[PDB]
Amino acid sequence: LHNLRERYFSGLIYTYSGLFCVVINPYKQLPIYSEKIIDMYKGKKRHEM
Amino acid sequence: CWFPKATDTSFVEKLIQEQGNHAKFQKSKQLKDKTEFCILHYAGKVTYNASAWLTKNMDPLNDNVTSLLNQSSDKFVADLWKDVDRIVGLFRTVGQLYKEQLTKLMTTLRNTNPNFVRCIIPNHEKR
Amino acid sequence: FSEEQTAEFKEAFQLFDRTGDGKILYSQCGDVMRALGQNPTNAEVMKVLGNPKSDEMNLKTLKFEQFLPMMQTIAKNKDQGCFEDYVEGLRVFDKEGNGTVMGAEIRHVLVTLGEKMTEEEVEQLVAGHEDSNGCINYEELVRMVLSG
């Protein structure tokens, strides 16, 4: 719970939990979806990001 | 849903008959007037209102006007309705029509590799 | 009727004589009024023709000067049809609220009620508005003859 709470308030919503991953709704317009960011993750492994 | 002397109520009562003591079933707040029942989902308890269930579950409608359109001048409405052979004026039930395709889906999923993205609601205040 | 149109009216009237005297058989009056964008009912035409008789309706003739006085008399009238009611009447033959009537039932009524039309007349009219099931959509057919 804690972890999720922190990251949440810090501005990060996506979090891994073993295989599956949690994703607390932000309800705010965070800026983490963009061509820029797309290419960042393109090919990038699981941990390389 | 296919018997005259039956009503949503009649249904529920029978409902209590079968399930009744189902570890996952529970009877309403003495409001069989509205005739409602409860079931213990995973996300929690819910009091459903069995009312009008037989109607919806049957999905009937005036074929008179149905076919009336079936050949209407307006092509769009024509092709829209062009297939009216199942209308009711007097086949398969909604609950099983659905519950049948939803097994089709549950089938391919079991044949693919799942990647779960468990969304989580932070608050109900939409804050 | 401004001379502007009156001047043209002549162009239309003149454009209506097979031989040449410059006369429109008592019959033609109707179509010539129509061609000039007039929709006089069958009675509104006879009334201003002194209610002749079939025979004399194919003998009697007309000259623009004596015709013009009628073109107007008609031109100015009390009523007229309109989608509003026009279709309201056909929608009564809509077997089952489909919004369309069978080009055969429409073809009937039109040639069995009031100013009875002819088998050909209706043919030429609806012709091409019947669908695969020979179904016509009045709402439209209405507008067609109308806005047309």
UniProtKB/Swiss-Prot annotation, chain A:
PTM-bearing positions, type N6,N6,N6-trimethyllysine: K28
Quaternary structure and partners: Muscle myosin is a hexameric protein that consists of 2 heavy chain subunits (MHC), 2 alkali light chain subunits (MLC) and 2 regulatory light chain subunits (MLC-2).
Recorded domain comment: The rodlike tail sequence is highly repetitive, showing cycles of a 28-residue repeat pattern composed of 4 heptapeptides, characteristic for alpha-helical coiled coils. Limited proteolysis of myosin heavy chain produces 1 light meromyosin (LMM) and 1 heavy meromyosin (HMM). HMM can be further cleaved into 2 globular subfragments (S1) and 1 rod-shaped subfragment (S2).
Localization annotation: Cytoplasm, Myofibril
Family recorded in the similarity comment: Belongs to the TRAFAC class myosin-kinesin ATPase superfamily. Myosin family.
Function statement: Muscle contraction.
Lineage summary: Eukaryota, Metazoa, Chordata, Craniata, Vertebrata
Protein name (Swiss-Prot/TrEMBL): Myosin-11
From-to range in the entire protein, with total length: 101 to 149 of 1979
